[PDB]
């Protein structure tokens, strides 16, 4: 016999159980109704307290769902923070692949360039010019340094009121940034393991090895194309209705690249991504 229903969010999925944070902040380890087809960290739930192990009664519809190449690992992500760094490698192709992933999942991306402390004036100007590629197509870019904490404040402001994950290649400083931001004292990131944490100034983050390894699954060409937001306005304006936007005569996208309206690396990476699929 249980009590009154209440809202909650899944902090972590214990395989057979789940730790649900109630709308009042208290965490309760709960069982899961057999009728629940799937429950993952980030799910918004209707639960009831036991009269101390409560029970999950239902799961609200997910605004988004993160999956592994097609099983859900996390739910209700609002923003994926794409983290890069000068070292070990600043890859525009990696960033572009992630952005395609964001557009496909329909979650807003946040491009973070970490380790700016490793650059001098000339280094800074170069990196900023690179990031302008992204600023110019509407994405917000943040220059930061975990070690110096520079730019960390605007990052917190961009994290508040949202549920994020930190995606990026190894060594860019994900664990470093998260530790600096979370200020954990009695927990440690795993440096079904996905767990959500609360940032001091608002907003949450779901983390674990798999989440950070957020990869791009098999996508159809059209999905890749939609994955480049600056392409949208040119679609339907190519000479051929079925223009593949490669060497096709009169391609509006390619010409835009040749005029400077679209960045060359974006077009180039668009094709590289297209190729690595099928
Ligand atoms: N110079 C510099 N080094 C950084 C910065 N942040 C992280 N590092 C170094 O980058 C390496 C990888 O950090 P890590 O958090 O493990 O990257 P991760 O694999 O994405 O979690 C070293 O462990 C960190 O000391 C930074 O802001 N500036
Ligand atoms: Mg603070
Ligand atoms: Zn075209």
Q: How far apart are CA 160 and CA 182, in angstroms?
A: 12
User: Quick one: 49 and 67 in the same domain?
Assistant: no
* Experimental technique of record: X-ray
Q: Could you tell me the residue range of the domain that residue 258 belongs to?
A: 217-278
Q: How far apart are CA 187 and CA 170, in angstroms?
A: 22
Q: Where are the beta strands (DSSP E) in the chain?
A: 6-14, 17-22, 27-32, 44-48, 54-59, 65-68, 71-75, 79-85, 108-114, 141-143, 163-167, 195-198, 204-207
Give the residue, by CA position, lying nearest to ligand 1 atom 14.
173
Ligand 3 centre to CA of 246 (Å) is 7
Does 115 count as an annotated binding residue? Answer: yes
User: Quick one: 52 and 66 in the same domain?
Assistant: no
Q: Which atom of ligand 1 is nearest to the CA of 191?
A: 21
Q: In which residue are the tokens 């690396």 written?
A: 265
Q: How far apart are CA 24 and CA 218, in angstroms?
A: 40
Residue 64 CB–ligand 1 contact under 6 Å: no
Structural domain total, the chain: 3
Does 24 count as an annotated binding residue? Answer: no
User: Quick one: 147 and 251 in the same domain?
Assistant: no
CATH number (domain holding residue 227): 1.10.40.50
Ligand 1 centre to CA of 100 (Å) is 25
Q: Crossing angle, helix 92-105 and helix 264-275, to 10 degrees?
A: 70
Residue 114 CB–ligand 1 contact under 6 Å: yes
Residue 173 CB–ligand 1 contact under 6 Å: yes
Helix (H, G, I), strand (E, B) or coil at 248: coil
Q: How far apart are CA 278 and CA 257, in angstroms?
A: 24
Residue 222 in tokens: 């059209």
Question: CA quadruple 14, 15, 16, 18: dihedral positive or negative?
Answer: positive
* 234 closest CA partner among 208, 215, 262, 206: 262
* 154 closest CA partner among 91, 193, 111: 111
Ligand 1 centre to CA of 83 (Å) is 11
Q: How far apart are CA 5 and CA 79, in angstroms?
A: 29
- Taking the CB of residue 51, how many other CB atoms lie within 10 A of it? 8
Residue 239 in tokens: 């000479």
Does 102 count as an annotated binding residue? Answer: no
User: Quick one: 88 and 128 in the same domain?
Assistant: yes
Rg (CA), the chain: 21
User: Quick one: 152 and 118 in the same domain?
Assistant: yes
Name the burial class of residue 275, with classes exposed (0-12), middle (13-18) and buried (19+) by CB atoms within 10 angstroms of its CB: exposed
Give the residue, by CA position, lying nearest to ligand 1 atom 3.
115
Asked if 114 contacts 83 with a C-beta cutoff of 8 angstroms, the reply is yes
User: Quick one: 66 and 199 in the same domain?
Assistant: yes
Resolution for the entry shown, Å: 2.2
User: Which of 216, 244, 269 is the last residue before a domain boundary?
Assistant: 216
CATH number (domain holding residue 23): 2.40.50.140
- Which of 120, 176, 209 maximizes ligand 1 atoms within 8 Å of its Cβ, making it the mutation to test the pocket? 176
Instruction: Give the pairing of strands 163-167 and 204-207.
Output: parallel
User: Which of 197, 216, 235 is the last residue before a domain boundary?
Assistant: 216
Ligand 2 centre to CA of 200 (Å) is 7
Residue 57 in tokens: 């009664």
| 145-166 core/surface letters (b: 16 or more CB in 10 A; e: else) | bbeeeebbeebeebbeebbbbb
User: Quick one: 95 and 141 in the same domain?
Assistant: yes
Q: How far apart are CA 41 and CA 100, in angstroms?
A: 23
* 84 closest CA partner among 155, 174, 153: 174
Ligand 2 centre to CA of 110 (Å) is 20
User: Quick one: 256 and 144 in the same domain?
Assistant: no
User: Which of 194, 216, 238 is the last residue before a domain boundary?
Assistant: 216
User: Quick one: 154 and 193 in the same domain?
Assistant: yes
Asked if 262 contacts 253 with a C-beta cutoff of 8 angstroms, the reply is yes
User: Quick one: 113 and 189 in the same domain?
Assistant: yes
User: Quick one: 112 and 130 in the same domain?
Assistant: yes
Please confirm whether the linkage preceding 156 is cis (ω < 30° from 0): no
The residues that bridge with 145 in the sheet, in sequence order, are: 150
User: Quick one: 78 and 185 in the same domain?
Assistant: yes
The bound ligand whose nearest atom lies closest to the alpha carbon of 170 is 1
Listed in sequence order, the residues at least 6 apart from 83 whose beta carbon sits closer than 8 Å to its beta carbon are 112, 114, 166, 167, 168, 172, 173, 174, 177
Does 243 count as an annotated binding residue? Answer: yes
CATH number (domain holding residue 107): 3.40.50.300
């Amino acid at each position: 016999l249980f009590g009154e229903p209440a809202e909650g969010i899944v902090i972590s999925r214990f395989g057979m159980h789940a730790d649900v944070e109630s709308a009042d902040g208290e965490v309760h380890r709960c069982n899961i109704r057999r009728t629940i087809r799937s429950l993952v960290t980030g799910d918004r739930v209707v639960w009831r307290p036991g009269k101390v192990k409560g029970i999950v009664e239902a799961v609200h519809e997910r605004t988004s769902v993160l999956t592994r190449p097609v099983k859900p690992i996390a739910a209700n992500i609002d923003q994926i923070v794409i983290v890069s760094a000068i070292l070990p490698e600043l890859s525009l192709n990696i960033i572009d692949r992630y952005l395609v992933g964001c557009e496909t999942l329909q979650v807003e991306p946040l491009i973070v360039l970490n380790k700016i402390d490793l650059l001098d004036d000339e280094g800074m100007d170069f990196v900023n010019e690179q990031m302008d590629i992204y600023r110019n197509i509407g994405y917000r870019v943040l220059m930061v340094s975990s070690h110096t904490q520079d730019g960390l404040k605007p990052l917190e402001e961009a994290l508040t009121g949202r549920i994020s994950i930190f995606a990026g290649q190894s060594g860019v400083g994900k664990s470093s940034l998260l530790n600096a931001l979370l200020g954990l004292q009695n927990e440690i990131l795993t440096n079904t393991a996905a767990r959500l944490y609360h940032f001091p100034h608002g907003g949450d983050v779901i983390d674990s090895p798999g989440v950070r390894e957020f990869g791009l699954w098999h996508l159809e060409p059209e999905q890749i194309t939609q994955g480049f937001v600056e392409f949208h306005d040119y679609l339907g304006h190519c000479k051929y209705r079925d223009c593949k936007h490669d060497a096709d005569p009169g391609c509006a996208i390619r010409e835009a690249v040749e005029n400077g309206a679209i960045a060359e690396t974006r077009f180039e990476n668009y094709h590289r991504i297209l190729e690595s699929m099928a």
